[PDB]
Design an enzyme around this catalytic site. Sequence first.
Site, PDB file in Angstrom:
ATOM      1  N   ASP A 140       5.118   3.394  -3.060  1.00  0.00           N
ATOM      2  CA  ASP A 140       4.168   3.107  -3.977  1.00  0.00           C
ATOM      3  C   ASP A 140       4.371   2.424  -5.104  1.00  0.00           C
ATOM      4  O   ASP A 140       3.735   2.708  -6.389  1.00  0.00           O
ATOM      5  CB  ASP A 140       3.295   4.695  -4.476  1.00  0.00           C
ATOM      6  CG  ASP A 140       1.921   4.458  -4.768  1.00  0.00           C
ATOM      7  OD1 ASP A 140       1.214   3.388  -4.492  1.00  0.00           O
ATOM      8  OD2 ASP A 140       1.329   5.603  -5.119  1.00  0.00           O
ATOM      9  N   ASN A 169      -1.680   1.768  -0.531  1.00  0.00           N
ATOM     10  CA  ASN A 169      -2.325   0.505  -0.877  1.00  0.00           C
ATOM     11  C   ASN A 169      -1.974  -0.550  -0.194  1.00  0.00           C
ATOM     12  O   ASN A 169      -1.947  -1.766  -0.636  1.00  0.00           O
ATOM     13  CB  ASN A 169      -1.832   0.130  -2.389  1.00  0.00           C
ATOM     14  CG  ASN A 169      -2.122   1.208  -3.659  1.00  0.00           C
ATOM     15  OD1 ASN A 169      -1.271   1.655  -4.577  1.00  0.00           O
ATOM     16  ND2 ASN A 169      -3.282   1.697  -3.428  1.00  0.00           N
ATOM     17  N   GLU A 198     -13.375   6.092  -4.004  1.00  0.00           N
ATOM     18  CA  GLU A 198     -14.792   6.588  -4.128  1.00  0.00           C
ATOM     19  C   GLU A 198     -15.828   5.643  -5.281  1.00  0.00           C
ATOM     20  O   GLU A 198     -16.843   5.355  -5.034  1.00  0.00           O
ATOM     21  CB  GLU A 198     -14.986   7.990  -4.700  1.00  0.00           C
ATOM     22  CG  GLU A 198     -13.645   8.439  -5.351  1.00  0.00           C
ATOM     23  CD  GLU A 198     -13.690   9.909  -5.426  1.00  0.00           C
ATOM     24  OE1 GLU A 198     -14.196  10.701  -4.944  1.00  0.00           O
ATOM     25  OE2 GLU A 198     -12.783  10.331  -6.333  1.00  0.00           O
TER      26      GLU A 198
HETATM   27  C1  LIG Z   1       1.759  -4.173 -11.375  1.00  0.00           C
HETATM   28  O1  LIG Z   1       1.701  -3.271 -10.389  1.00  0.00           O
HETATM   29  C2  LIG Z   1       2.349  -2.266 -10.535  1.00  0.00           C
HETATM   30  C3  LIG Z   1       3.103  -1.778 -11.575  1.00  0.00           C
HETATM   31  C4  LIG Z   1       4.087  -0.754 -11.856  1.00  0.00           C
HETATM   32  C5  LIG Z   1       3.837   0.397 -10.594  1.00  0.00           C
HETATM   33  C6  LIG Z   1       4.925   1.450 -10.914  1.00  0.00           C
HETATM   34  C7  LIG Z   1       6.288   1.180 -10.619  1.00  0.00           C
HETATM   35  C8  LIG Z   1       7.100   0.349  -9.785  1.00  0.00           C
HETATM   36  C9  LIG Z   1       8.517   0.668  -9.762  1.00  0.00           C
HETATM   37  C10 LIG Z   1       9.276  -0.231  -9.040  1.00  0.00           C
HETATM   38  C11 LIG Z   1       9.600  -1.636  -8.996  1.00  0.00           C
HETATM   39  N1  LIG Z   1      10.366  -1.843  -8.385  1.00  0.00           N
HETATM   40  C12 LIG Z   1      11.328  -3.254  -8.043  1.00  0.00           C
HETATM   41  N2  LIG Z   1      11.420  -0.728  -8.367  1.00  0.00           N
HETATM   42  C13 LIG Z   1      10.918   0.174  -8.603  1.00  0.00           C
HETATM   43  C14 LIG Z   1      11.264   1.588  -8.907  1.00  0.00           C
HETATM   44  N3  LIG Z   1       8.525   1.693 -10.454  1.00  0.00           N
HETATM   45  N4  LIG Z   1       7.226   2.190 -10.871  1.00  0.00           N
HETATM   46  C15 LIG Z   1       4.151   2.893 -10.581  1.00  0.00           C
HETATM   47  C16 LIG Z   1       4.826   2.370 -11.917  1.00  0.00           C
HETATM   48  C17 LIG Z   1       3.283   0.053  -9.509  1.00  0.00           C
HETATM   49  C18 LIG Z   1       2.504  -1.010  -9.361  1.00  0.00           C
HETATM   50 MG   LIG Z   2      -0.594   2.941  -6.089  1.00  0.00          MG
END
Ligand SMILES: COc1ccc(C2(c3cc(-c4cn(C)nc4C)[nH]n3)CC2)cc1
Ligand SMILES: [Mg+2]
Length: 220
Positions: A140, A169, A198
């Site tokens: 995620d 997603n 929703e």
């Molecule tokens: C812009 O869309 C987003 C932005 C942030 C996130 C989040 C996230 C992503 C990572 C992460 C990325 N890598 C490569 N490794 C890791 C561990 N950690 N946390 C959920 C907080 C999800 C989607």
């Molecule tokens: Mg998500």
Amino acid sequence: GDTKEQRILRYVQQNAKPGDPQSVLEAIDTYCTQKEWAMNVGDAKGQIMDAVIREYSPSLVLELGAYCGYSAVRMARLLQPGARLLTMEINPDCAAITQQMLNFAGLQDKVTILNGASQDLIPQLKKKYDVDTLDMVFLDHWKDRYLPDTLLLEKCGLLRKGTVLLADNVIVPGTPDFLAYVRGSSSFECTHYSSYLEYMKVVDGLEKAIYQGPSSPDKS
Ligand SMILES: COc1ccc(C2(c3cc(-c4cn(C)nc4C)[nH]n3)CC2)cc1
Ligand SMILES: [Mg+2]
Ligand SMILES: [K+]
């Protein structure tokens, strides 16, 4: 400076009860339903997550992209004693919030929080965190990383026959390369779980991908 993620934690700390993961989940979902939207929450999605944990009873779970800890709380609450969750969060402030969220929920002894990028941390799991193979992986984090990190997990020997990947997603905003790969490959047996978002009034979904073992070399 105040942030959305700090507000979510404050709202949990004010309204939920310590050591009660269910009250924590309900406070987060209420807040994100009524006050301000946030990533990586949702009871509807969470229903599907619960069912997977319940069915496969994983003893070792890896989560990529903890954010505020909603999914880590969701999963760790259903883990048997001695089971463990490793969760990765690339943003240090979000890692800190996830840790206090899990602490508040009383699940801090079940979860290890790793602050770093997935492609950096995944190959350290065997050496640093005494992992043999993972029973389950929940994806995620950054959507363009689902496919590479999956291939990387395989590469690193972290997947076994029967390992459950669960990816969120995959429809909105979507992970087309990932889906084509795991569905097209004989190494993954795939089930899609639709779930209605929703208030955006749109269908999203999770993909469950069960590892079948690596593709065999040509024979004759
Ligand atoms: C812009 O869309 C987003 C932005 C942030 C996130 C989040 C996230 C992503 C990572 C992460 C990325 N890598 C490569 N490794 C890791 C561990 N950690 N946390 C959920 C907080 C999800 C989607
Ligand atoms: Mg998500
Ligand atoms: K497949």
